[PDB]
Amino acid sequence: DPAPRLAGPPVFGGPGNDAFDLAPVRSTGREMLRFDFPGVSIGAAHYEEGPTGATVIHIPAGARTAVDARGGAVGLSGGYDFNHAICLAGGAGYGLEAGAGVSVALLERLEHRTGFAELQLVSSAVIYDFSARSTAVYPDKALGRAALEFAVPGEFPQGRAGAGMSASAGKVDWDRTEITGQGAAFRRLGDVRILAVVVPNPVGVIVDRAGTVVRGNYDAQTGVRRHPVFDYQEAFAEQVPPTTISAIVTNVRMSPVELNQFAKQVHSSMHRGIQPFHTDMDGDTLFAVTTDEIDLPTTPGSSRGRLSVNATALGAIASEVMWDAVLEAGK
Amino acid sequence: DPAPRLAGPPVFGGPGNDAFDLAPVRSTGREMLRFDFPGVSIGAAHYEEGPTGATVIHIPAGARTAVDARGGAVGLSGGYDFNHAICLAGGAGYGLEAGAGVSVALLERLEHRTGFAELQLVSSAVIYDFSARSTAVYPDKALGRAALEFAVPGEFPQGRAGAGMSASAGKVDWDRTEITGQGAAFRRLGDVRILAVVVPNPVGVIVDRAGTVVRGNYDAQTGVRRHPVFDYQEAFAEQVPPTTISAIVTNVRMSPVELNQFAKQVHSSMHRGIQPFHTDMDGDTLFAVTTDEIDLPTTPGSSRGRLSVNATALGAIASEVMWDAVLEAGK
Amino acid sequence: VDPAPRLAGPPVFGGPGNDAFDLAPVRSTGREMLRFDFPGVSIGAAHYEEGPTGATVIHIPAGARTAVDARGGAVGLSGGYDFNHAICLAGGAGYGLEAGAGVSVALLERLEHRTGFAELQLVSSAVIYDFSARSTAVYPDKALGRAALEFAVPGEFPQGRAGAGMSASAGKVDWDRTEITGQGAAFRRLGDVRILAVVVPNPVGVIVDRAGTVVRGNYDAQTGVRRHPVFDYQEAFAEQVPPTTISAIVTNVRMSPVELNQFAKQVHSSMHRGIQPFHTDMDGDTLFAVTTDEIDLPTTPGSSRGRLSVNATALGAIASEVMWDAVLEAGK
Amino acid sequence: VDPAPRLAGPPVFGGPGNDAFDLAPVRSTGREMLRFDFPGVSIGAAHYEEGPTGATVIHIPAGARTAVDARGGAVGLSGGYDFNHAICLAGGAGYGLEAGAGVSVALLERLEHRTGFAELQLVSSAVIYDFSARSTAVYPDKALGRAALEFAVPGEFPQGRAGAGMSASAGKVDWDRTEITGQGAAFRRLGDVRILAVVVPNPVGVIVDRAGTVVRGNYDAQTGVRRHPVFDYQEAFAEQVPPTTISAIVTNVRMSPVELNQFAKQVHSSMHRGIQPFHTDMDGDTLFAVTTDEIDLPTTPGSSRGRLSVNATALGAIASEVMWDAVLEAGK
């Protein structure tokens, strides 16, 4: 039962990027998650003038990726099956520009080599975060460059940081929408490593493992948050008749087919912690990335069961890491 | 905390259809759900010799449909965007034959007219139910004909009936798998009607709204059911290194795009009640069907919120009907 | 000389059904037998004269990785599996998917009714709507699919009016101009590399040869010639708006699931050379790309003929020619 | 007479980048201007001589329903929205998606930085890899996309080496045989029905005319002629295995999302007539089908030319011819 963070009513007429001398800020959030995942780096930058920002996951070696662009209102660039970086940003479709800044920065680091096998590949996805503030500032090329420059191994800024600066949840009615943030979680099991990163800007609300609504759809008249379905069902009885962007990164080798099905499974699992989810109103996009370092055993047995060690098993574990990250974003 | 229904170990060498004089049985289940949904009929038939069966949803006028074949191991026939019937069956891919029986029975009722606009369209999906018994009997053409002949408005046989005869859940290890069944639920809100039908044969387990595991992955050594992720995570720590078929039927007019996104949303929502879900091991297939009788208002407001009456709202309500149906199947 | 017409005639869209007849499957021989060498692949074609309608079955008992490209707007598909023991192509619109159920249960019987996972027999089926081309409602049923599998043999394919091609037809701007096609196959061996194409063209469009000549479909009995449909369509718009093909490509070259899927799309799109228009709303065009995984491509793609000359795309280009040859055999 | 060669020359795969130059956008004029009448649609083409590389922007300020058919195996796409205010086609591989960001922010500025939903400016962008055809790493950047939008005018299209077509090339079995193409457009009006095709062919394959002659790409300087790639591929397999095109079709005819999506697939597949091979692993082929929703098809599809003659498939067949004309203009 956290204190409310109501976003408040829309403001119109606000200034855009051209109005300011915009200075990127290295986002620190409310606290830093630290973890051990060699070969992965994360950077987060924001403009205070939005407030809005971008979060970049950089895997300099490049990593095989599956994309599950499941929502009805997706803002995606690249969506490549192999990436050197994933860029998550505010600013609606304008914020895809941040990924261009990452791309060209990587081209510069590569000394402008352009062989087809050396192209630097950045996939980007965005949230609409303009209802949560009163400017039109968006993550631009310079901000994406800055988020990459700020990237370091083994750290993630929780909360209002990067793409999470103006993320919000619970959009039955804007008077009940609350600011979320971005979140991350990490587990290591044996040699296996799983990192989840999420920027929940859902139409739905964030739900914990007990089924409590913990962020979004807060009614100041009652002091209580509501699951949206209670609102929806009563709206129907009255009147008829009268986005989350996310990444899961692991080091377990998966074939393209396993990796794709892993992405679908983990993404669907997020309907536990975000409700409703995968709606027409949402642009929900999950990237499943593997650094392809650790083999699963050829056969799937253990003391825990004959079918206990396989990609589905990994997907179930990763689903829990992701739920933890969603709850960090809503905290 | 229901009593266990352990399916027990595989049996091999069992007899197939050719060995028996197979008599269809009208399935009655453990109890009958009654509801008011003109233009929809449901029939369920089984062979005791399996035990295995088929469940047919017949909409004689035909209805617009979206299919969300999300699992990794799908057994689907037709998958049409307009259907006169949906056939759900056991018998793995062999059980798609039941839908052929429905199709030809409908052709006969149409006096063998064959104009392109008069083709009778049946979409079928199947579960693998051979690990839950010791015969190779499957739902054949005759059984699909029988399920159609047995179809009546406004009734559904809950539990071990039709396609649910030998459905089972919780497949980390076969020694912990439990028999489920089929389930249905129905709500009417104003003029809006929503019927959910489900045959859960998941690799995962059935979970209630409190987060309790209520069917599947039962350990006779402990007397307790386990969420699979506890098994999976310990299997990884040890060793590295050392299907649900469903339909939602409503009467609300939705465009092809709304109906498709509605299908995705409702299907993903089932990861609340079935965990894990949408895995590589599963052939999860949802049909979203509308009889296109009731308009939504042109604008989405109500006293409950500015964005409270739309297809996403309907999807959230339908998601709850579906969860109720899953819990009926597991009861 | 322009080919003689094979007009289908005016459709009635109905007639007696299967049980009005004592239906005996006939092993289809077509007009000619293609013979080829590709062990592990058998083809069977059966028909009912009383339709006339039929089914063609490709049986690969080892099982083979498959990509499905269901590109048309009116597809009739069952299974569509990424690994198949058989592919069943049939007439009878969606009713003819039943033929594949006959193949499936016959294969289960051969496996002594074993039902373990590695033992499930996987049959993907696709259909053409062939009811415009005859005055009956007979369709390929379980018995006909069983018969087509029983008749399957390696190294033979009956060209023309045979199996699923028995009542296939082309050129559907107006039914008065529609012509019977057939089924067709072609085969090439390049060293030990093997490519087999099988096609059952029932297009809304017409069959076109490598010169751009319309050779089957859209025959106007008032002119004695076949025009490209676009001439009819453009004239129709001036007046009124004033100011399925099912196919398989089978190869022995190893391709990963990703390469195989893209190969399927490439070969399928290539068929818009020989069938025009293609991939329309009005078509249920479905191509199965199957590999028996017997021989590897070299690790690098060079040859004397270029730096990017030996790869799955190259194989796709070669297979596209085999498929155009098969289309032309169907229309011959 | 066979067309003269335009060999691209041997690629070095790198060179100076954008900020090595003081880059001024140039309004591209190409070899010739196509003129046509289609109010509500503007086209702008800009290039950097220092690449050479460029971008071509189609601006539809009302916004228009769109279907995207990203059929190739190596696609570079941003947005891919089902409703667009602009389509941006560019060189520079994935770096050139940045040009579309320039278009997007220019449109936001025109809207006075309003950010409501109905006001979000939607730009879909696609790219070709044109770095093989020049010795620099200059790409279409935000400034070049802004310039292409500023230069956009109704009723004009610069054919040839212009905009995104500036360094487009064809026929990539071996880089020694690759030839510069260009961009191309064609237009037809049938009563008030309007169809505009725009294409930037950078294929692995070659451009083929209606006779089946290879007209651009795969020019062998040792023979003085262009062969179909399949001749090279089949010879390569004998030896070594011993025993992108981005495009738009814009029409004013109303089509539902379902019809429009199938129309996109149909027209895109039709391009395997003029580009061969096509839809390969090696290609990022992406077609945008856009309707401005100005005129209805009749409710029933009949005419004097047939019972099924006036429908979205018919429109697709006509549009496929407009697109082949555009491909040939690009290769001319």
PDB file of C-alpha atoms in Angstrom, chain C residues 118-276:
ATOM      1  CA  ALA C 118       9.083 -38.907 -31.296  1.00  0.00           C
ATOM      2  CA  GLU C 119       6.571 -41.267 -32.794  1.00  0.00           C
ATOM      3  CA  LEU C 120       3.691 -38.926 -33.560  1.00  0.00           C
ATOM      4  CA  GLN C 121       3.106 -39.021 -37.300  1.00  0.00           C
ATOM      5  CA  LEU C 122       2.897 -35.514 -38.656  1.00  0.00           C
ATOM      6  CA  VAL C 123       0.957 -34.776 -41.845  1.00  0.00           C
ATOM      7  CA  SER C 124       0.442 -31.268 -43.179  1.00  0.00           C
ATOM      8  CA  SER C 125      -2.389 -30.841 -45.642  1.00  0.00           C
ATOM      9  CA  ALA C 126      -3.511 -28.106 -48.018  1.00  0.00           C
ATOM     10  CA  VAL C 127      -6.431 -27.830 -50.390  1.00  0.00           C
ATOM     11  CA  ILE C 128      -7.727 -26.278 -53.583  1.00  0.00           C
ATOM     12  CA  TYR C 129     -11.330 -25.307 -54.251  1.00  0.00           C
ATOM     13  CA  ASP C 130     -12.158 -27.471 -57.255  1.00  0.00           C
ATOM     14  CA  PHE C 131     -15.977 -27.461 -57.022  1.00  0.00           C
ATOM     15  CA  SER C 132     -16.302 -24.792 -59.830  1.00  0.00           C
ATOM     16  CA  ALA C 133     -14.832 -27.353 -62.293  1.00  0.00           C
ATOM     17  CA  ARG C 134     -17.466 -30.156 -61.853  1.00  0.00           C
ATOM     18  CA  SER C 135     -21.079 -30.757 -60.990  1.00  0.00           C
ATOM     19  CA  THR C 136     -20.658 -32.923 -57.872  1.00  0.00           C
ATOM     20  CA  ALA C 137     -19.841 -32.389 -54.218  1.00  0.00           C
ATOM     21  CA  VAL C 138     -17.515 -35.443 -53.992  1.00  0.00           C
ATOM     22  CA  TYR C 139     -14.373 -34.622 -52.030  1.00  0.00           C
ATOM     23  CA  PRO C 140     -11.098 -36.333 -51.013  1.00  0.00           C
ATOM     24  CA  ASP C 141     -12.031 -38.242 -47.869  1.00  0.00           C
ATOM     25  CA  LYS C 142     -10.110 -40.352 -45.381  1.00  0.00           C
ATOM     26  CA  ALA C 143     -10.297 -43.339 -47.690  1.00  0.00           C
ATOM     27  CA  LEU C 144      -8.805 -41.382 -50.596  1.00  0.00           C
ATOM     28  CA  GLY C 145      -5.900 -40.115 -48.471  1.00  0.00           C
ATOM     29  CA  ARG C 146      -5.218 -43.667 -47.297  1.00  0.00           C
ATOM     30  CA  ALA C 147      -5.230 -44.783 -50.954  1.00  0.00           C
ATOM     31  CA  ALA C 148      -2.885 -42.069 -52.078  1.00  0.00           C
ATOM     32  CA  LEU C 149      -0.427 -43.098 -49.356  1.00  0.00           C
ATOM     33  CA  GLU C 150      -0.799 -46.801 -50.298  1.00  0.00           C
ATOM     34  CA  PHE C 151      -0.082 -45.897 -53.922  1.00  0.00           C
ATOM     35  CA  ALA C 152       2.982 -43.830 -53.064  1.00  0.00           C
ATOM     36  CA  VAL C 153       6.216 -44.868 -54.731  1.00  0.00           C
ATOM     37  CA  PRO C 154       9.654 -43.284 -55.038  1.00  0.00           C
ATOM     38  CA  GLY C 155      10.819 -41.705 -58.238  1.00  0.00           C
ATOM     39  CA  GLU C 156       7.493 -41.298 -60.079  1.00  0.00           C
ATOM     40  CA  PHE C 157       5.048 -38.455 -60.551  1.00  0.00           C
ATOM     41  CA  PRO C 158       1.888 -38.544 -62.739  1.00  0.00           C
ATOM     42  CA  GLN C 159       1.697 -35.304 -64.685  1.00  0.00           C
ATOM     43  CA  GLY C 160      -1.556 -33.594 -65.616  1.00  0.00           C
ATOM     44  CA  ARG C 161      -5.037 -34.608 -64.553  1.00  0.00           C
ATOM     45  CA  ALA C 162      -3.994 -36.790 -61.643  1.00  0.00           C
ATOM     46  CA  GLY C 163      -4.353 -36.687 -57.864  1.00  0.00           C
ATOM     47  CA  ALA C 164      -5.069 -33.206 -56.515  1.00  0.00           C
ATOM     48  CA  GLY C 165      -4.728 -31.843 -60.063  1.00  0.00           C
ATOM     49  CA  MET C 166      -7.652 -33.795 -61.411  1.00  0.00           C
ATOM     50  CA  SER C 167     -10.057 -30.762 -61.434  1.00  0.00           C
ATOM     51  CA  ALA C 168      -7.593 -27.906 -60.886  1.00  0.00           C
ATOM     52  CA  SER C 169      -8.260 -24.861 -63.079  1.00  0.00           C
ATOM     53  CA  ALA C 170      -6.922 -21.383 -63.879  1.00  0.00           C
ATOM     54  CA  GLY C 171      -8.077 -17.908 -64.848  1.00  0.00           C
ATOM     55  CA  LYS C 172     -11.051 -16.764 -62.836  1.00  0.00           C
ATOM     56  CA  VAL C 173     -11.855 -13.218 -63.907  1.00  0.00           C
ATOM     57  CA  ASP C 174     -14.887 -14.945 -65.374  1.00  0.00           C
ATOM     58  CA  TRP C 175     -15.780 -18.624 -65.115  1.00  0.00           C
ATOM     59  CA  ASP C 176     -16.499 -18.692 -68.867  1.00  0.00           C
ATOM     60  CA  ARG C 177     -12.754 -18.270 -69.483  1.00  0.00           C
ATOM     61  CA  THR C 178     -11.438 -20.702 -66.833  1.00  0.00           C
ATOM     62  CA  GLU C 179      -9.406 -23.682 -68.073  1.00  0.00           C
ATOM     63  CA  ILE C 180      -8.483 -26.997 -66.487  1.00  0.00           C
ATOM     64  CA  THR C 181      -4.820 -27.192 -65.500  1.00  0.00           C
ATOM     65  CA  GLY C 182      -3.556 -30.333 -63.760  1.00  0.00           C
ATOM     66  CA  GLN C 183      -0.713 -31.062 -61.380  1.00  0.00           C
ATOM     67  CA  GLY C 184       2.949 -30.901 -62.343  1.00  0.00           C
ATOM     68  CA  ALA C 185       6.391 -31.859 -61.179  1.00  0.00           C
ATOM     69  CA  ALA C 186       9.971 -31.265 -62.158  1.00  0.00           C
ATOM     70  CA  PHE C 187      13.300 -32.514 -60.837  1.00  0.00           C
ATOM     71  CA  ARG C 188      16.954 -31.509 -61.078  1.00  0.00           C
ATOM     72  CA  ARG C 189      20.090 -33.146 -59.828  1.00  0.00           C
ATOM     73  CA  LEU C 190      23.281 -31.011 -59.591  1.00  0.00           C
ATOM     74  CA  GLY C 191      25.949 -33.547 -58.508  1.00  0.00           C
ATOM     75  CA  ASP C 192      24.264 -35.266 -55.558  1.00  0.00           C
ATOM     76  CA  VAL C 193      22.140 -32.110 -54.803  1.00  0.00           C
ATOM     77  CA  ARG C 194      18.498 -32.927 -55.552  1.00  0.00           C
ATOM     78  CA  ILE C 195      15.511 -30.621 -55.996  1.00  0.00           C
ATOM     79  CA  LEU C 196      11.940 -31.847 -56.591  1.00  0.00           C
ATOM     80  CA  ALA C 197       9.064 -29.426 -57.230  1.00  0.00           C
ATOM     81  CA  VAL C 198       5.404 -30.466 -57.047  1.00  0.00           C
ATOM     82  CA  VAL C 199       2.586 -28.048 -57.820  1.00  0.00           C
ATOM     83  CA  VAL C 200      -1.193 -28.033 -58.064  1.00  0.00           C
ATOM     84  CA  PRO C 201      -2.066 -24.677 -59.700  1.00  0.00           C
ATOM     85  CA  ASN C 202      -5.724 -23.745 -59.266  1.00  0.00           C
ATOM     86  CA  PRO C 203      -5.070 -19.975 -59.581  1.00  0.00           C
ATOM     87  CA  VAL C 204      -7.327 -17.022 -59.905  1.00  0.00           C
ATOM     88  CA  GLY C 205      -4.557 -15.921 -62.268  1.00  0.00           C
ATOM     89  CA  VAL C 206      -3.142 -17.600 -65.355  1.00  0.00           C
ATOM     90  CA  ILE C 207      -0.099 -19.699 -66.202  1.00  0.00           C
ATOM     91  CA  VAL C 208       2.649 -17.732 -68.002  1.00  0.00           C
ATOM     92  CA  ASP C 209       5.690 -19.095 -69.813  1.00  0.00           C
ATOM     93  CA  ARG C 210       9.228 -17.749 -69.773  1.00  0.00           C
ATOM     94  CA  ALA C 211       8.524 -15.527 -72.786  1.00  0.00           C
ATOM     95  CA  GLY C 212       5.637 -13.864 -70.998  1.00  0.00           C
ATOM     96  CA  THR C 213       2.976 -15.690 -73.009  1.00  0.00           C
ATOM     97  CA  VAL C 214      -0.252 -16.721 -71.251  1.00  0.00           C
ATOM     98  CA  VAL C 215      -0.463 -20.471 -71.851  1.00  0.00           C
ATOM     99  CA  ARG C 216      -3.332 -21.681 -69.619  1.00  0.00           C
ATOM    100  CA  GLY C 217      -6.322 -19.821 -68.210  1.00  0.00           C
ATOM    101  CA  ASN C 218      -8.398 -16.838 -69.274  1.00  0.00           C
ATOM    102  CA  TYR C 219      -9.205 -18.295 -72.722  1.00  0.00           C
ATOM    103  CA  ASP C 220     -11.833 -16.098 -74.417  1.00  0.00           C
ATOM    104  CA  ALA C 221     -13.894 -18.287 -76.715  1.00  0.00           C
ATOM    105  CA  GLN C 222     -14.966 -15.149 -78.618  1.00  0.00           C
ATOM    106  CA  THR C 223     -11.328 -14.351 -79.584  1.00  0.00           C
ATOM    107  CA  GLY C 224      -9.630 -17.739 -79.553  1.00  0.00           C
ATOM    108  CA  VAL C 225      -6.809 -16.435 -77.410  1.00  0.00           C
ATOM    109  CA  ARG C 226      -5.658 -16.000 -73.810  1.00  0.00           C
ATOM    110  CA  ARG C 227      -4.902 -12.450 -72.553  1.00  0.00           C
ATOM    111  CA  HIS C 228      -3.249 -11.530 -69.286  1.00  0.00           C
ATOM    112  CA  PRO C 229      -5.966 -10.862 -66.671  1.00  0.00           C
ATOM    113  CA  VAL C 230      -4.772  -7.302 -66.229  1.00  0.00           C
ATOM    114  CA  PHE C 231      -6.283  -6.399 -69.607  1.00  0.00           C
ATOM    115  CA  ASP C 232      -9.703  -7.508 -68.331  1.00  0.00           C
ATOM    116  CA  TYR C 233      -9.179  -5.811 -64.950  1.00  0.00           C
ATOM    117  CA  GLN C 234      -8.117  -2.455 -66.456  1.00  0.00           C
ATOM    118  CA  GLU C 235     -11.085  -2.505 -68.881  1.00  0.00           C
ATOM    119  CA  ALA C 236     -13.422  -3.423 -66.034  1.00  0.00           C
ATOM    120  CA  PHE C 237     -12.295  -0.453 -63.941  1.00  0.00           C
ATOM    121  CA  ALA C 238     -12.758   1.905 -66.945  1.00  0.00           C
ATOM    122  CA  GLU C 239     -16.327   0.671 -67.259  1.00  0.00           C
ATOM    123  CA  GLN C 240     -17.508   0.301 -63.629  1.00  0.00           C
ATOM    124  CA  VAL C 241     -15.449   2.873 -61.776  1.00  0.00           C
ATOM    125  CA  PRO C 242     -15.859   5.845 -64.165  1.00  0.00           C
ATOM    126  CA  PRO C 243     -14.758   9.396 -63.132  1.00  0.00           C
ATOM    127  CA  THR C 244      -5.118 -21.203 -55.062  1.00  0.00           C
ATOM    128  CA  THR C 245      -1.911 -22.952 -55.810  1.00  0.00           C
ATOM    129  CA  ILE C 246      -0.588 -25.572 -53.385  1.00  0.00           C
ATOM    130  CA  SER C 247       2.983 -26.675 -53.812  1.00  0.00           C
ATOM    131  CA  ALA C 248       6.038 -28.351 -52.338  1.00  0.00           C
ATOM    132  CA  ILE C 249       9.739 -27.967 -52.913  1.00  0.00           C
ATOM    133  CA  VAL C 250      11.792 -30.881 -51.568  1.00  0.00           C
ATOM    134  CA  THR C 251      15.566 -30.798 -51.447  1.00  0.00           C
ATOM    135  CA  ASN C 252      18.332 -32.827 -49.800  1.00  0.00           C
ATOM    136  CA  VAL C 253      20.448 -29.789 -48.878  1.00  0.00           C
ATOM    137  CA  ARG C 254      20.729 -29.029 -45.171  1.00  0.00           C
ATOM    138  CA  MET C 255      19.262 -25.639 -44.235  1.00  0.00           C
ATOM    139  CA  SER C 256      18.711 -24.284 -40.774  1.00  0.00           C
ATOM    140  CA  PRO C 257      15.092 -23.382 -39.781  1.00  0.00           C
ATOM    141  CA  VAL C 258      15.848 -19.692 -40.578  1.00  0.00           C
ATOM    142  CA  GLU C 259      17.401 -20.359 -44.025  1.00  0.00           C
ATOM    143  CA  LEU C 260      14.624 -22.861 -44.833  1.00  0.00           C
ATOM    144  CA  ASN C 261      11.884 -20.366 -43.946  1.00  0.00           C
ATOM    145  CA  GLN C 262      13.424 -17.656 -46.123  1.00  0.00           C
ATOM    146  CA  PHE C 263      13.971 -20.199 -48.924  1.00  0.00           C
ATOM    147  CA  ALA C 264      10.262 -21.004 -48.774  1.00  0.00           C
ATOM    148  CA  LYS C 265       9.313 -17.326 -49.122  1.00  0.00           C
ATOM    149  CA  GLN C 266      11.763 -16.813 -52.005  1.00  0.00           C
ATOM    150  CA  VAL C 267      10.632 -19.836 -54.004  1.00  0.00           C
ATOM    151  CA  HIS C 268       6.974 -19.044 -53.352  1.00  0.00           C
ATOM    152  CA  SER C 269       7.298 -15.439 -54.525  1.00  0.00           C
ATOM    153  CA  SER C 270       9.195 -16.646 -57.581  1.00  0.00           C
ATOM    154  CA  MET C 271       5.977 -18.371 -58.699  1.00  0.00           C
ATOM    155  CA  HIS C 272       4.464 -14.950 -59.527  1.00  0.00           C
ATOM    156  CA  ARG C 273       6.614 -15.291 -62.676  1.00  0.00           C
ATOM    157  CA  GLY C 274       4.627 -18.279 -63.890  1.00  0.00           C
ATOM    158  CA  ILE C 275       1.268 -17.536 -62.252  1.00  0.00           C
ATOM    159  CA  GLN C 276      -0.207 -14.055 -62.634  1.00  0.00           C
TER     160      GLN C 276
END
